[PDB]
């Protein structure tokens, strides 16, 4: 399914 993009702004 989805990857981190889902926008992981706190990475």
């Amino acid at each position, epitope marked *: 399914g*989805a990857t*981190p993009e889902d*926008l992981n702004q*706190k990475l």
Partner: antibody
Amino acid sequence: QDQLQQSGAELVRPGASVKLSCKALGYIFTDYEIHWVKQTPVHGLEWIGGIHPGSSGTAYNQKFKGKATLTADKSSTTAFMELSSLTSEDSAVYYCTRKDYWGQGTLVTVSA
Amino acid sequence: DIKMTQSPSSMYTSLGERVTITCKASQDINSFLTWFLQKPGKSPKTLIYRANRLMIGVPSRFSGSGSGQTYSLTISSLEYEDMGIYYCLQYDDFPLTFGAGTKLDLKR
């Protein structure tokens, strides 16, 4: 790819505290942020905050800063949300979400 | 706060009909939008993510489009199991914000 499992229904007394848990299963816990969202018939859906179990970074909605504490345990792939000083307005369904997957929600009833 | 204006807010539809729901954002959200649906008493189920990716398990009847500020969700032929409330989620910036929801009901 799998799922979020939330703790059961909580009945608390005004002024007390609750800690809700969200277990992440079937996906790498450290690559995705877990976000907590509040739902009530009056206000609809609202974002509380969120945490990156990876980097440990947290972000909060201004309205919940000082009320809610977000934490995550990497050994149990469990994100946690603490709510202090409860009043009846805190009475809601609470949801953890990965933005795509959603936990099933825990009902918190604040009552005497 | 990015504002999400979801319309219409309630729609009276027939089974088998094509439905379109929209969300305008107060600023450009770079396609970071989800589309989910909630049935009475049940938790939210995401349908679409990053504006137009179907979610594993979702009929191809659902399709999402848009870029920048205007996003749409089309349901090609409406089924009984699609009844419920539809929301959009912007996750471009914090705080995350939701649309007011779109309530679907069968006309009669």
